[PDB]
Amino acid sequence: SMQDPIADMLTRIRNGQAANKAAVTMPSSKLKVAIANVLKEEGFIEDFKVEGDTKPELELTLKYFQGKAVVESIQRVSRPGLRIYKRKDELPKVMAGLGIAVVSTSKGVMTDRAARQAGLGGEIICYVA
Amino acid sequence: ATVNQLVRKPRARKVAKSNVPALEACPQKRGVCTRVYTTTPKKPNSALRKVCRVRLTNGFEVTSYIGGEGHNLQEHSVILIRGGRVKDLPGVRYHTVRGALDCSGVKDRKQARSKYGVKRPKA
Amino acid sequence: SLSTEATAKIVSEFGRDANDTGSTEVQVALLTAQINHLQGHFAEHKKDHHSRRGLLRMVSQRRKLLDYLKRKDVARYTRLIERLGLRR
């Protein structure tokens, strides 16, 4: 959005899923693609690309196993006016461990397990189940 | 509300109103007994019950219920208020202790001796 | 609103170049005119409120621009407020 560009990413992804869409598109961003990269390895998204050397536009591909979709849970937490910063011993564990939790570390964007395995903390980004 | 709207004017409490004039945070209070009434209950019930105005030690006057199947108080006898209001009797949110001070206590009662005025019957 | 022979006129007086109808120095100044000119209009009628709403708009809108200059080039601010006899 014009105020919360990251929160929009999640919404556009979840809104697409519900509508059984194929691919979601929206303006890119260092953090955005960075986040989009994680869900990739996590198998939450098929692939992802962008267009524009001056006018970048993210391109994500939704995913679904059977009748229902894959990403059946995606919400934010560390939003503006109410940001969240956890330690290496406070990091959340989405769905008892199954779901992932994106968190920006001094090393870069990671997941609840990722950063933990490292032994460092960062500003939580969102919960993906 | 929102964090901002909370930081300003948070969540207010609620001064618990303890329905009891003879407060002073006490289990009971001593009285003097102004008189002995026999007022009638509300609309749902009938039969005249026994009550009595009490001049609590703290001045705070108030009518207390005189439960039990047998009254025996006087217009000067000293009783002890306890609590527990009564529906049928409005304004009467108290009861005179049975078997204490210058009062008496139920007679011939063999059940629920603790309550009322009775302590181990004729055996 | 404003006459072309005036709008397209002033633009060529504050623009740091040519046909820069965007430049704050320009737009901002362009606002003072339509404002000062209307003050003579509002002097009459008065009760005409729906027109003042727009008047106030361009006024605050003008200020929103002045604050910007101060937060982009201190000089340009004090360098323009004079040419327009602003601040009063």
Binding site: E42, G43, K63, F65, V70, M95, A96, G97, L98, A129 | - | -
Partner: protein, 150 residues
Amino acid sequence: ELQEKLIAVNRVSKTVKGGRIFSFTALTVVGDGNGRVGFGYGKAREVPAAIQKAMEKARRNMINVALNNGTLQHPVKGVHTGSRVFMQPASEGTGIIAGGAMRAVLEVAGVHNVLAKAYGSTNPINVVRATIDGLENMNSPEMVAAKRGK
């Protein structure tokens, strides 16, 4: 073996020309200590006749929960109508921690260790299903690897 359980039964009425008639309802949950359940709800002019229907209707239209070691894989969360129910799995040792409906629906689904709570309306007719919908969503730790493995 299927284990039925009578949640509760209300009377309910109906005013008409002549006067006013009544017809008890009753709700029943059935299942096995494996991972299958499904409540039932039937009416009747007789206390026993009612439960008879609900039971039949119960055995059918069941469900299959992704239970693990006598408990839930993770703290699921379901809601329905005005009933907000949140269930959470606990290690062996803790009995079934639930009020009414929930406590029952689980004592037949194969649940042994949990600790829920009814937030919204305590209506049995709903809290009973608000729970079933919870487990009905319970994502098992399996398949997830396939849901995004390839």
